[PDB]
Amino acid sequence: NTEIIKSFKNFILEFRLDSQFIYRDQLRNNILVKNYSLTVNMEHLIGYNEDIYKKLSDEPSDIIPLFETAITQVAKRISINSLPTFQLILNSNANQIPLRDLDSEHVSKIVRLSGIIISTSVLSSRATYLSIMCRNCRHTTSITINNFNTGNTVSLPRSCNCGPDPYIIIHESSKFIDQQFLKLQEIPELVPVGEMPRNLTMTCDRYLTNKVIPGTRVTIVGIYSIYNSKNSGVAIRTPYIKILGIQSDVETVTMFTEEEEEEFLQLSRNPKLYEILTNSIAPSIFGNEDIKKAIVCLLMGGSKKILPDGMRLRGDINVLLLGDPGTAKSQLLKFVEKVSPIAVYTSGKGSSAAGLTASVQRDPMTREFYLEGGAMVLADGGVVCIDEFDKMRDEDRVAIHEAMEQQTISIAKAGITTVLNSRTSVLAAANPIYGRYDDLKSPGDNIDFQTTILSRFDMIFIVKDDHNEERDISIANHVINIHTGNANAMQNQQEENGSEISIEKMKRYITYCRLKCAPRLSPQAAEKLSSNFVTIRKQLLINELESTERPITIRQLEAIIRITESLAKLELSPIAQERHVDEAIRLFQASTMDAAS
Amino acid sequence: LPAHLQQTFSPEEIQFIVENEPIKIFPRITWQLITTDDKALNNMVAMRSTEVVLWIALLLKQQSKCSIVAPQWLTTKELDRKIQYEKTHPDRFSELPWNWLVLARILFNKAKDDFHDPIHELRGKIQDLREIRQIKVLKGLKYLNESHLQLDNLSLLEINELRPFITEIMDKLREIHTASL
Amino acid sequence: VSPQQDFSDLMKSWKNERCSPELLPYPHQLMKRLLNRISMQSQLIENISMGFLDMQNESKLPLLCMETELERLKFVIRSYIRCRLSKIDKFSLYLRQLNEDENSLISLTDLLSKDEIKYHDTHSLIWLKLVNDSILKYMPEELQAINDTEGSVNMIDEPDWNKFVFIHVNGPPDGENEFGKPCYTVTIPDLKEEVELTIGSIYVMRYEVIRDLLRDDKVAL
Amino acid sequence: NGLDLMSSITFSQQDTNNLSHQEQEYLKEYCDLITDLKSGDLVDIDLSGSLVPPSDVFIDVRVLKDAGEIQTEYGVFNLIKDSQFFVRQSDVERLIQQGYLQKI
Amino acid sequence: ISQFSEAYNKILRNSSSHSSCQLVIFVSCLNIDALCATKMLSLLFKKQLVQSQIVPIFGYSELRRHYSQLDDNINSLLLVGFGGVIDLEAFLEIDPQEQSFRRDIYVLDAHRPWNLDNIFGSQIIQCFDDGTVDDTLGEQKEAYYKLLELNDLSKRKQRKKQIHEYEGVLEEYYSQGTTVVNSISAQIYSLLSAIGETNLSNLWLNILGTTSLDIAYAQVYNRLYPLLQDEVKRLTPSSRNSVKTPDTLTLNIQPDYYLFLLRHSSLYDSFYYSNYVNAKLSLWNENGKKRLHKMFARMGIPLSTAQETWLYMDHSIKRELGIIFDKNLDRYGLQDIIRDGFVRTLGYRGSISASEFVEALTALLEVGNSAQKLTNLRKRWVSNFWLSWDALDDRKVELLNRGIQLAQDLQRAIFNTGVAILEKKLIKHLRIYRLCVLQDGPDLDLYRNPLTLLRLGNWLIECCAESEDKQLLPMVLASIDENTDTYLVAGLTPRYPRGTKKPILNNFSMAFQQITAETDAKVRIDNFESSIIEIRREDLSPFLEKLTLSGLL
Ligand SMILES: Nc1ncnc2c1ncn2[C@@H]1O[C@H](COP(=O)(O)OP(=O)(O)OP(=O)(O)O)[C@@H](O)[C@H]1O
DSSP states (O other), X not given: OHHHHHHHHTTTTTOOSTTTOTTHHHHGGGTTTTOOBOOOOHHHHXXXXXXXXXXXXXXXXXXXXXHXXXXXXXXXXXXXXXXXXXXXXXXXXXXXXXXXXXXSSOTTSOXXXXXXXXXXXOOOOEEEEOOEEESSSOOEEOOBOOOOOOOOSSOOOXXXXXXXXXXXXXXXXXXXXXXXXXXXXXXXXXSOSSOOOOBOOEEOOGGGOSOOOSSOEEEEEEOOOEXXXXXXXXXXXXXXXXXXXXXXXXXXXXXXOSHHHHHHHHHHTSSOHHHHHHHHSOTXXXXXXXXXXXXXXXXXXXXXXXXXXXXXXXXXXXXXXXXXXXXXXXXXXXXXXXXXXXXXXXXXXXXXXXXXXXXEEEETTTTEEEEEEOSSSSOSSSEEEEEOOSXXXXXXXXXXXXXXXXXXXXXXXXXXXXXXXXXXXXXXXXXXXXXXXXXXXXXXXXXXXXXXXXXXXXXXXXXXXXXXXTHHHHHHHHHHHHHSSXXXXXXXXXXXXXXXXXTTHXXXXXXXXXXXXXXXXXXXXXXXXXHHHHHHHHHHHTTGGGSOOOOOOTTTHHHHHHHHHHHHHHHTOSSOOHHHHHHHHHHHGGGTGGGTO | OOOSSOSSOOTTTTTTTTTTSXXXXXXXXXXXXXXXXXXXXXXXXXXXXXXXXXXXXXHHHHTTOEEEOOOTTOSTTTGGGHHHHTTTOSSOOOOOOSSHHHHHHHTTSSOSSSSSSOTTTTTHHHXXXXXXXXXXXXXXXXXXXXXXXXXXXXXXXXXXXXXXXXXXXXXXXXXXXXXXX | OOTTHHHHHHHHHHHTGGGOSSXXXXXXXXXXHHHHHHHHHHHHHHHHHHHHXXXXXXXXXXXXXXXXXXXXHHHHHHXXXXXXXXXXXXXXXXXXXXXXXXXXXXXXXXXXXXXXXXHHHHHHHHHHHHHTTTTGGGOOTTOOSSSOOSSSOOSSOOOOTTOOEEEEEOOOOOOXXXXXXXXOOOOOOSSSOOOOOOSSOBEEEOSTTTSGGGTTTSEEO | OOSSSOSOOOSSOSTTTXXXXXXXXXXXXXXXXXXXXHHHSSSOOOOXXXXXXXXXXXXXXXXXXXXXXXXXXXXXXOOOTTOEXXXXXXXXXXXXXXXXXXXX | XXXXXXXXXXXXXXXXXXXXXXXXXXEESSOHHHHHHHHHHHHHHHTTTOOEEEEEEOOSXXXXXXXXXXXXXXXXXXXXXXXXXXXXXXXXXOOOOOOOOSSEEOOOOOBSSOOHHHHSSOSSBOOOOSTTOTTTTGGGGTTTTTTTTOOGGGTHHHHHHHHHHHHHHHHHTTOSOOOBSSOHHHHXXXXXXXXXXXXXXXXXXXXXXXXXXXXTOSSTTTTTHHHHHHHHHHTOOOSSOOTTOSOSOOEEOOOBOSSOSTTTSOGGGHHHHTHHHHHTTTXXXXXXXXXXXXXXXXXXXXXXXXXXXXXXXXXXXXXXXXXXXXXXXXXXXXXXXXXXXXXXXXXXXXXXXXXXXXXXXXXXXXXXXXXXTHHHHHHHHHHXXXXXXXXXXXTOOTTHHHHHHHHHHHHHHHHHHHHHHHHHTOOEEOSSSEEOOOOOOSOGGGGSSTHHHHHHHHHHHHHTOSOOOSOOOOOEEOOXXXXXXXXXXXXXXXXXXXXXXXXXXXXXXXXXXXXXXXXOSSOBOOSSSTTEEBOOHHHHHHHHHTTTTOOOO
């Protein structure tokens, strides 16, 4: 109402805490750079009046438009015409009833949720300012459609003998807003008896869209209003969420503040990063020092050279594990999932290997095909994780050969044939032929036939089962510490708070130090690896005279040059050194003699 | 050898040249001031104006044995005539006390419990003037001719803020005009 | 010659330096009129506090105002002589070239005092003994003296001589020499029209269009 | 440029004390050439910092990371661990730049 | 002997110069009321324009190695609550030097067992003897007044018997427990009113210290609930509301409850410490979640706008609590909830009362960070003390909320072993007390600092706050985290269920002098408060054996 409005233009130009005067001092600061938006922060709003909140929190749609018009008028005042309407962004943190209140009282009430968005759609257009002409008398009006009860808020009237529906929609003086129809999925840990999860639907506005990629946790605040589409028995309807503010966690397109890198620059000046991360990554893993160094260089990566001709160099690494059960080859892999920016966990069976890359289907509108799914289209930049590279006998091998070593797939199916980009990084952990007897026989028979998959991977660990009767009792001392008593929650808060790094700071950290520094190895260091390699092939061919066959080829040699590029991304030095590169071969030379044994 | 802020002034010493200008007080107390710029008095009579320099009077309010009087333009019933000569004139701003913005900030920290209703009224009638001035300056510099501008009523604060870019952003174009021939 | 008059001139002759492109004559004469004063008033409050010590086998005001005042005035000349050092460092090769051959200006007493030309000749010496033995061992026989012959002329000067500076016009109204219609102001560019100042309007200009009118302090910065 | 243990150029950049110690003759020269400039002025004006202008007389100051008895001149302040101070402004400038008193 | 206005002007002239004529004060950090009294004294010295020096001290054995080794011309030392019982002059000797002495201290003790040498024998110990106790141990007027001057062997023997009669009246004295009768907020605020400085910040500050003693006594602040009602009315800032002013820091009165941290947090969370109120009734773990789900469950509480159903929608729902809490009058008789309360505001930013405000200060004093490890541990509590004294002004806001979020988990943490030891059933009623030795459960590390231990006992004194018509004795606990069996053992006080007719103080500190004199094999009184001592493991088992026979109540 007008009276209500008189009670908001007189409130969002003098609200302040103690001499900062903030809401004029950001609205001006948001009219210079074109954004046209507010962040009210409703829990901070309550200082005026509980009544004016309660005329909002009990009734909808009317309140949003009245508030928007008041803000537009104040914005107009802070100038002296090209002036668009604004949009609001609200945010609070009460608690998130996950997906349980459905119809009881939470219809058109303010609500806060948490989910994982999986499926985006293409953009669209709805109008917000029109100009309408009649057939009979050339009448001219203008009707604005701001907020919604989707369309059919108000229809085109009959007034201007005169025939009905005399009006049309011209396209010469109009404005448009875009919706999304992105689909929210439940975070799959908090509905536990035995059931599958469900899903909802949500739309939004332009100045808060395209802020999400699928594969992230998000929190979300909004309305629970109801539409009705006539494409089921009783006159029913359907639920959806009009959303207001995605004040989620980080993106997990590199814009952020300066103090986030201030401590990072204050940490990177300390030259103790490489030895301290091996403890600070996995706080519940007994040592395993050689493997732990390989995981931090996998997550960072190398570079990508598009050198001045057609071809390119595949600048990344892909580790591979195998070993006996009970030796941490599997439980380590859930640990790399949370720390990655983008991580996918399809670790089982291969899951119908043609469906790993891309899939088509008949689509219900227009009876057509296009491309929808895939386990590799969403995992660019990050890392996938799979297992069991023995009993996928059908088609796992034919589905990763083109997927690796060029990362340029193209689907030859009934519709398109397009080379969509990929920058993926694979990771796997398998089993040999029941472990023990394989390492007590002729040392082949690990992958039963093919060496051609092994030559695409580069870095291979082989763990074993010793009987060291001394350190094992410390391991038996180690597991009873974590498993009950939970003193490592209090030990790794009394050794971490000055020395170690918590689990969530690295997710902040890795996305910054990758996306800034473009490094290059030292040019005079090229004498080192060339002098290194020539005896390794001699160390190879000293074994084949013993009637021994299989695997070392040159692709691992151009992988070590990516390995020495990896820690240069860690130290963020644009040039490499020789104390740098000798520790890198120190990691690989502990996996050169593995081919001998 | 600072090598940090040399071309300009920091905002910690532009206040230093305005604190050495005098205003009027209401004394209370009864040689005492031989400061070489002093004007010491005898037993001082209350209810009498006297032009005293500001920085000792700020120190005199710490021991709290005096009281300040506001200057003649520091009520909300007086700045209303200022905000109409500008809204009819997009040409320039007319009438300014020339040191106003740095004056009120000293006059609100520890000088809040002196005047009748400064709070919830005067800061509304100040921050509007902090931007209507600077709305005018954004139309101004787009009209940049060669080596000729016209600023009439500019504060010491804004002239310390337009400064460190407007010099070299026209000096760099002074090359291509002059060194063309 | 009142001490209030003998201080407001100092403040005006400090701020004008702080955005200057080139050096100004160091007014040593007025400094010596107050170089005694900073010693005297420290000595005045030296013993007069000791009489307040010996009265106690009341007043806390008149000591505190004296102590903070003269050090605040001492703070101004603390910055005022460092920026001379911050300016005389870069300009060294130019000013010696103004001082080597005989010309219209000498590095005089009213230009520079005792210690900074004692600083300048010594520091420019030890600067030359860094480039010589550690770098210019393999310097061939055309690059001996560090000054530009031709090619890249940057070992010579600071010719920043049209840097812009905000001006405040503060002409003393005595008519006296009146030329213009509102007041007496003049200008002359190198190329453009002679549109000028009026009374106190803040303007922007180059330097040699205003270098003449600052020898007589009729217009401030 | 000389506040406390000036000639101690140690505990500072010792790995690059083959860089700078080989140029210390310049560093020492600047050092000695700034000592007489502290005395070439016929009246003692401080040149060792204090570049920010003063504000008032009384400043709340805390202390940490320090011990021992310092400040033999201008009255001994009895500097012991984690102690508040509330003093005159003009005596702390030779310790803030020293980095012994911490917060204003 | 010292009227309150006199010592202020007396300490004025003794250190007022603009030089290093420094006066220094010492303060115990472990008491919350000890802190807030000192803060208001410092700021009036700022507008008295004098230099100062503020040094905290926590160790009663550490008092020597701060004062008694680093002194130059410090004429005016000052304490707050240090020497009520143990004589510091025998602890720190001062020879008669320069009747009109040269170095002068005061003291601001708050304890009932005094020591007559400090008040009488005031060559240097100028204590605050004004109208604190006008009946200051009325037997003193002939007891030691005949001890100062000390055929006739039938007369002197009677005179020595009179001295022996004076001996027992000085033997019954120095044989009582201790407390604080009047908090130090009461003295200095009354002293400032004799000077007459009108600021509501002082009126906000002084009420915090008496609010801290709402857990160690009942009625001393019931003696002062009148003496604040006049002051909130005499210092009335306004008759109208005079709305929309962001300033002016107004004061009001609304009835508040023992469901603490409510207006900060979630009326939900009462879910834990309403069972504390049912531990104040009868139960802690068995039936409560079966019991509690009618009264505190007027809904299965909606979390749609719940952040403003304990902020805003409670306009109707806590006014229904305004009409529930007179029909929950009879429902369980649970009337330790209605309390008069007091509140402050800011102009904006939500109200904050003073009940929950002392809760944040206690928890924030805890967290916020041979025999050589103790120095790096004794220096921690003094450091994290310092990030709380600054939290009383609006110059900091955004760490006051950090104690709020550290309040409502440490209480969940301290409960997480209290429910364990209660169902361990290791509380052994021997003859008089009950002994509990927490040998090692989980989460042992949060019991080095003693301030958590009195709260742990404050929850543990309430599990035995059933009827218990016989054997109303508090307990003694035991724990260990570090080397050489430190074992910061402590005692408690018994508690009345609000029906003091017999003001029980303590019986332990009398016996604590005995065992610190008899065994003499690693026993310590180095920790400050007499209610807490240390003991060795092989001596804590014969500790009680001398205690089970020595009946000293
Ligand atoms: N090196 C190690 N350090 C600490 N804990 C370990 C280590 N190796 C295994 N564990 C423990 O083993 C427990 C269960 O592991 P799990 O049963 O998943 O092993 P697994 O999958 O059979 O081993 P593998 O991955 O070799 O097959 C985990 O809780 C983990 O703590």
